[PDB]
RNA sequence: UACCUGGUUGAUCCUGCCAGUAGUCAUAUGCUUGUCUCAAAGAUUAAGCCAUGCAUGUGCAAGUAUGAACCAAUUUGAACUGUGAAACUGCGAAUGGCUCAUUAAAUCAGUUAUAGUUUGUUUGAUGGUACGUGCUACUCGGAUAACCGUAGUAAUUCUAGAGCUAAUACGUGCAACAAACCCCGACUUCUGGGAGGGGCGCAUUUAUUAGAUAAAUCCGAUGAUUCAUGAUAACUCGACGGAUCGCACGGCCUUCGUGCCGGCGACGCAUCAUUCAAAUUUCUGCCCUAUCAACUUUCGAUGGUAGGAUAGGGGCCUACCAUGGUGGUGACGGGUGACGGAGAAUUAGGGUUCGAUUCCGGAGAGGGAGCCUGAGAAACGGCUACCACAUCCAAGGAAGGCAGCAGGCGCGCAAAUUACCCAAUCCUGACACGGGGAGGUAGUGACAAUAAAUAACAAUACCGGGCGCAUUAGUGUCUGGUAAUUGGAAUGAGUACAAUCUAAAUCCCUUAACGAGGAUCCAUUGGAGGGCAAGUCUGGUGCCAGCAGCCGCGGUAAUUCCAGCUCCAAUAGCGUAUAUUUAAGUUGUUGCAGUUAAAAAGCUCGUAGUUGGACCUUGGGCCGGCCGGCAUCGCGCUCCUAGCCCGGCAUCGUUACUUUGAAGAAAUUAGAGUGCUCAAAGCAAGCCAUCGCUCUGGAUACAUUAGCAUGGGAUAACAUCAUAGGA
RNA sequence: CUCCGCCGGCACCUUAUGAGAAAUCAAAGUCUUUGGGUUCCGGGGGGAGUAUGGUCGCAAGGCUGAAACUUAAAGGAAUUGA
RNA sequence: CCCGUCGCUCCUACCGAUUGAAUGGUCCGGUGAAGUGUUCGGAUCGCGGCGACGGACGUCGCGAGAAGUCCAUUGAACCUUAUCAUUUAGAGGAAGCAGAAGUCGUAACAAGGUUUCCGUAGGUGAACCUGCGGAAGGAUCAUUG
RNA sequence: UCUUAAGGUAGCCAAAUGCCUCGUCAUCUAAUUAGUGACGCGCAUGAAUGAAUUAACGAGAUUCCCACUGUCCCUGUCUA
């Protein structure tokens, strides 16, 4: 039409928001922000629909305008903020930290972390290039721009950032054999170790990953995300250690949980 | 305008050939012998049977070791076993095709009341259902097509408010009593 | 449920249609209607016309206050202290909503691309020189609304003038080094210089130069660039580089001087990136029509070059040149009662028909056309002009746009309230407070869909079939019923204390007392010849009235009409009309037929099209329990994957087909879990001692065609080692 | 000219084990156990090979070719009777 | 059983002089509102330089700035012709159908009383007749008698 | 049924051929004895006395429409 669309209808909402169908006509319409806004969750979905600390739009407004809800080292009072992958959401009054990760079935969990693994975050880089006066800088998929990059940190790689020094402390070089976890598509959620990476001139680079227990799959580059060097992750995985389990297997889990009680 | 989005569908289908002696008298056999309100209830039963048999037919079309086969084969079989609609040692996914509308009609709550006694008639069973006289665990049920599961079958019993099995006597009782007193 | 039935005949076997049969989230209508849940509703005809009212405005501690108010109230110094209505300023009004008129490779879907672009905002990072002869900043302008006052006009958020007073409105204007380097350049000593002093932020444009290799001291990206970026010479009458606003005070004297100072924010300028997007754009795909075979091109058609314009590519436009572009693989043209898609109905499979409509995209706001502001508009709840329509006029003038909500007229077979509300879902603003006919709630609502009442149970009876002997009886078991017979039980329809529900009521769910004698708390719709279920009943009519989908009935004994009894099918539903699906193997690719039932061209040639004979090693083995790897009579590999000399390595014919993988919007459908009491549904909810919390789920599938990617080479097309110009 | 055999012709006689509504057919078979390739062509009977348009022809006419409306049968094969 | 003409009633469509008519579009040309951009233009309004002059004056500093106007460009809207398409009128001519209890015949079905019929040509009130060639869907599957 | 040698065929028409006649109907016009197109029992149409059409052409005859005009309303004036 004749400008930006400022309403979002619940059915048009991303499928991983889980939100119901007769709940209304409209959805939170996540504001423009630092993350892709189709791969994100508004802090209203973080508060009302997952943690249930409120029960209405206006009560979530009270939550956020109290200045309690602090994201990534700094309080964000916007109620449609596109919080997404490894954004850390802290609450001083509850002294309670959360970190937003994919779970194996393609959705977002809020995994609790203690303070030491909440002092910092971890994100991949979009691309590193020069700027004014020849000073190099790199761009992350969180949008952050970092100047004077370590001369070895390259594109597609991963970098840890503290919230006080607010710069790089270490980086994982995206390469063969380091644990990744896909962040988009049908394979999203599953962690695994890269086992192969083939490139075709002029198209998306394909990443073949193997899970911790035998299964193998493939993914496009924009979706994969190294976590740690080697098999060991540098982040606390959720209750499913990044293994997507077949529906038969997950039926057996619930059957066994039934027959164990 | 939301609430347009709440789905809804049809539950039976009127038969193809309207006037057949064979089908007409077979359906009267069933309706009278289960004491039903009309033949709409019967036609819902053939509709549910048609649904489950279509699913089972498509499942049997495939071959074993196919994860789609195993999953909703097992789902359909556990649904049947929860409704007790198959017997023990009979889970084969073909005995689902074998079953017929008598099986569903036999699980309706009227029938279960009749077979547990407590009715003295199947039409008396239906009415007792609709005058709030019967609960299942604790909740009084008034839908004679309640389709009881076997895990609820054992303790289908009167309400705590019906005059027969619960508390105070009914309004006819209390009129007769107060005019006697 | 992958189905048939009546009608050509004296009868038979057919081709064959006619009629029957069933559905429609498919409309109208007719009859009828007690309860619960759910919920389409002026699309088809008129994208016809509109009275009235509303639908977009906005206020924080943080841009502007003794202009006029309210609350504090003054030691009568200063505040305007605190609440602020009006107004300036800023932002939004480019979303929402409504409709489907125009539009048939166009929009649209899947899939690309922007290295060919703009993007308020978010988020993150970022920013010297304003002149001083680069030797540390150098000065503060009135006027304007609101108010007060004088007015025209019949008049409208029509309008002139006087007096006041602000800025984060407007307009000026202080600048943080060594100058790093760049070019001039006195003289010294001779210079390869010392150089004394004179010229240089960031954006804009132009131009130069760099932005590095290959085996016997080179340093970013791409699949791909003169890319990112740097240096230079300049260039602009430079947009910019903060004269802004909040609280909390609180270490310490240099002149003990609000004193040296200092943090946390709000707003704002510009650059880059991000994001919200947009705009273009690649490939493939759309209904009927040949009584639409040529269309385009002087005047843009197709391309080239140069430019202009755009944010940007581009005949988008201009000048010149070339003579091209599309088509029997259907162009151009015409129809469409044609917005596209997700999808809907029906479906054994395949299909057929539909899709105005709540989700996405596009297009319009009576019909065209043109623009302001703004980041965003060719906006219409913005303007300008014309045309059609129409309102007020005090007769000069003025205001217009319901295909927004509701409502009125008309058109029609056809479609409800001029209601309530911001509480939910979200949007919006300067913003925790305002606003929101978006959206929700309620009234009409047999559109469609769900559960589902209208009695039940007992002995009595003329009775009615065995069963206890079953003769010879007689009464006997489930009770079968004509029983308004007799009888006490059960209840919700309804009424209703109350509570609950609700933004407030209302409904539902609970439930004080009331609420059944069978006449009522009364079920209808259609039919009773065949199909097709149910009268060789009775009365009336007499080829009439009429019925009848078709075959047929009615000419005084009507199974067919009009009536009553009885009955039947469905049952709170059913009939009727049209359209459409099935039937229909009567559109047939699966899957029809052409001797005679409709249909082989009179016959041959013939281009496209369709279809195309056979032939090419995985031939035999090991090996371990459908396949890895092996060897045999395996063109080589240097390089990443590369053995405890060595598996499994690049480039040097295409496709189809096929396997697997990725990406694939939800809603719809299939389908997992889940006792809304069931069910349609919904996405919840379930268990703790159901005492200050646990466990959570919110699966999964499908998605043909086009595109990308991996394994195979059977099958099928194309191209082609005989000139050897071969290896 | 007699005999025997090959092909390629034009046909014929007998039989279903086939096909067909049958009449009949050794090709009208190898068809619901439905798929060698290809062209033309039919969708109940009329209106009608008509009107209109096009096109060819000296003309007669040829090729291409509807609709409205109407109708419940028209038609094929065989049986008996008259 | 049955074919056609003629007579009558009704329905549907056809041809048809009428420079037929109406509605809606499209193209060329004429005229051209309005906006945007552009040229001149300069109503007033800003240090109110200087005369060292008595709130005034001229030399005034340049910058703003409206009406108007010029030229382009987009271009509504009207007008004339052409033409397309959809409906509609038409004296007369002539088809098809349906109806009825009509008139004239006897064409066809048997060897239908002249075997039928196909193509073509001519004629006749009507069916039809005849000429030339063809077919059997014939009344002959047959001349070694 | 009389009669002829034969009984006006194909066509065509109030035609330059139709007396009745200003034929009847439609069209054109405000109004039409005119024009065209049809109707034909045609005083007295008609087939090489050639019949019916017929594009082009015509100092041929007739009707209408547009432009144009002192032909006219209605005259005035100028020049040789
Ligand atoms: Mg919109
Ligand atoms: Mg079928
Ligand atoms: Mg017949
Ligand atoms: Mg008969
Ligand atoms: Mg039918
Ligand atoms: Mg429409
Ligand atoms: Mg309108
Ligand atoms: Mg160019
Ligand atoms: Mg349309
Ligand atoms: Mg839409
Ligand atoms: Mg618009
Ligand atoms: Mg507009
Ligand atoms: Mg409006
Ligand atoms: Mg309205
Ligand atoms: Mg009745
Ligand atoms: Mg009747
Ligand atoms: Mg009757
Ligand atoms: Mg019957
Ligand atoms: Mg009827
Ligand atoms: Mg009948
Ligand atoms: Mg057929
Ligand atoms: Mg034939
Ligand atoms: Mg032939
Ligand atoms: Mg060929
Ligand atoms: Mg036909
Ligand atoms: Mg016959
Ligand atoms: Mg005869
Ligand atoms: Mg004869
Ligand atoms: Mg004969
Ligand atoms: Mg003759
Ligand atoms: Mg003769
Ligand atoms: Mg014969
Ligand atoms: Mg004559
Ligand atoms: Mg005459
Ligand atoms: Mg005249
Ligand atoms: Mg004449
Ligand atoms: Mg004569
Ligand atoms: Mg004569
Ligand atoms: Mg002669
Ligand atoms: Mg003569």
XYZ file of N, CA and C (backbone and C1' of nucleotides) in Angstrom, chain A residues 2, chain C residues 365 368-374 377-380 382-385, chain E residues 33-37 72-75:
178
model
N 0.460 2.277 0.741
C 1.121 3.573 0.686
C 2.005 3.841 1.895
P -9.385 6.845 -6.518
O -10.736 6.840 -5.690
C -11.976 7.060 -6.341
C -13.137 6.769 -5.428
C -13.522 7.904 -4.490
O -14.924 7.853 -4.250
C -12.890 6.028 -3.222
P -12.349 6.103 -13.773
O -11.357 6.891 -14.734
C -10.578 7.970 -14.247
C -10.428 9.050 -15.281
C -9.153 9.863 -15.212
O -8.031 9.200 -15.760
C -10.964 11.318 -15.442
P -6.661 9.146 -14.929
O -6.100 10.631 -15.011
C -5.811 11.222 -16.263
C -5.639 12.712 -16.149
C -4.565 13.197 -15.199
O -3.260 13.103 -15.731
C -6.515 14.456 -14.867
P -2.018 12.935 -14.734
O -1.975 14.318 -13.955
C -1.730 15.534 -14.642
C -1.652 16.700 -13.691
C -0.677 16.549 -12.541
O 0.642 16.875 -12.941
C -2.737 17.435 -11.762
P 1.883 16.641 -11.955
O 1.584 17.609 -10.737
C 2.442 17.672 -9.619
C 1.891 18.624 -8.598
C 2.329 18.370 -7.170
O 3.582 18.965 -6.893
C -0.019 18.623 -7.244
P 4.366 18.612 -5.541
O 3.604 19.457 -4.436
C 3.636 20.873 -4.445
C 3.074 21.406 -3.159
C 3.700 20.822 -1.909
O 4.887 21.499 -1.545
C 1.347 20.709 -1.739
P 6.175 20.674 -1.067
O 5.824 20.285 0.434
C 5.337 21.260 1.345
C 4.713 20.621 2.555
C 5.497 19.480 3.175
O 6.523 19.942 4.031
C 3.227 18.857 2.960
P 8.008 19.356 3.897
O 7.861 17.852 4.383
C 7.384 17.560 5.687
C 6.952 16.123 5.794
C 7.960 15.099 5.311
O 8.959 14.818 6.272
C 5.872 14.618 4.361
P 5.502 8.400 -1.424
O 4.015 8.037 -1.840
C 3.092 7.569 -0.866
C 1.664 7.776 -1.297
C 1.489 8.484 -2.632
O 0.324 7.983 -3.282
C 0.483 9.764 -0.919
P 0.403 6.641 -4.163
O 0.747 7.160 -5.626
C -0.288 7.563 -6.514
C -0.766 8.957 -6.208
C -2.019 9.404 -6.960
O -2.819 10.213 -6.102
C -0.266 10.914 -7.374
P -4.234 9.676 -5.573
O -4.107 9.775 -3.995
C -3.330 8.830 -3.276
C -3.787 8.713 -1.845
C -5.250 9.068 -1.600
O -5.793 8.206 -0.607
C -3.864 10.453 -0.285
P -6.572 6.874 -1.046
O -8.092 7.165 -0.679
C -8.890 8.015 -1.489
C -8.813 9.441 -1.018
C -9.813 9.881 0.034
O -9.421 9.484 1.334
C -9.523 11.573 -1.624
P -9.825 14.361 5.730
O -9.187 15.403 4.709
C -8.542 14.979 3.514
C -7.633 16.058 2.981
C -8.109 16.831 1.767
O -9.097 17.799 2.063
C -5.836 16.295 1.515
P -10.131 18.254 0.923
O -9.258 19.146 -0.065
C -8.959 20.495 0.252
C -7.790 21.024 -0.545
C -8.091 21.431 -1.975
O -8.662 22.722 -2.070
C -6.157 20.093 -1.943
P -9.753 23.030 -3.202
O -8.915 23.019 -4.549
C -7.943 24.016 -4.805
C -7.495 23.977 -6.241
C -8.598 23.771 -7.262
O -9.282 24.964 -7.584
C -6.832 22.283 -7.716
P -10.823 24.900 -8.016
O -10.765 24.293 -9.480
C -10.159 25.035 -10.523
C -10.117 24.260 -11.812
C -11.405 23.578 -12.228
O -12.325 24.465 -12.833
C -9.609 22.081 -12.480
P -6.558 26.882 -21.083
O -7.217 26.711 -19.646
C -8.453 27.336 -19.344
C -9.229 26.566 -18.307
C -8.514 26.317 -16.993
O -8.593 27.426 -16.120
C -9.522 24.317 -17.737
P -7.253 28.080 -15.541
O -6.655 26.942 -14.612
C -7.423 26.386 -13.558
C -6.798 25.112 -13.061
C -5.315 25.193 -12.760
O -5.048 25.744 -11.485
C -5.736 23.290 -14.076
P -3.727 26.624 -11.250
O -2.628 25.545 -10.864
C -2.916 24.554 -9.895
C -2.062 23.328 -10.079
C -0.567 23.558 -10.173
O 0.031 23.760 -8.906
C -1.243 22.036 -11.844
P 1.366 24.637 -8.772
O 2.471 23.736 -9.470
C 2.824 22.481 -8.916
C 3.815 21.760 -9.786
C 4.999 22.589 -10.232
O 6.001 22.694 -9.241
C 4.092 21.484 -12.094
P 6.763 24.086 -9.022
O 7.815 24.132 -10.211
C 8.786 23.111 -10.345
C 9.341 23.049 -11.742
C 9.862 24.346 -12.323
O 11.114 24.757 -11.817
C 8.547 23.283 -13.930
P 5.989 26.486 -26.299
O 7.041 25.357 -25.932
C 6.606 24.086 -25.488
C 7.410 23.621 -24.308
C 6.866 22.405 -23.592
O 7.215 21.204 -24.242
C 7.410 24.058 -22.011
P 6.072 20.295 -24.892
O 5.759 19.240 -23.748
C 6.806 18.736 -22.940
C 6.304 18.364 -21.573
C 4.926 17.735 -21.532
O 4.934 16.362 -21.866
C 5.067 19.412 -19.884
P 3.627 15.690 -22.502
O 2.694 15.438 -21.244
C 3.128 14.604 -20.186
C 2.216 14.716 -18.996
C 0.736 14.582 -19.286
O 0.313 13.243 -19.445
C 1.082 16.444 -17.903
P -0.621 12.858 -20.687
O -1.950 13.694 -20.433
C -2.703 13.518 -19.245
C -3.503 14.750 -18.907
C -4.667 15.067 -19.819
O -5.800 14.271 -19.539
C -3.448 17.037 -19.393
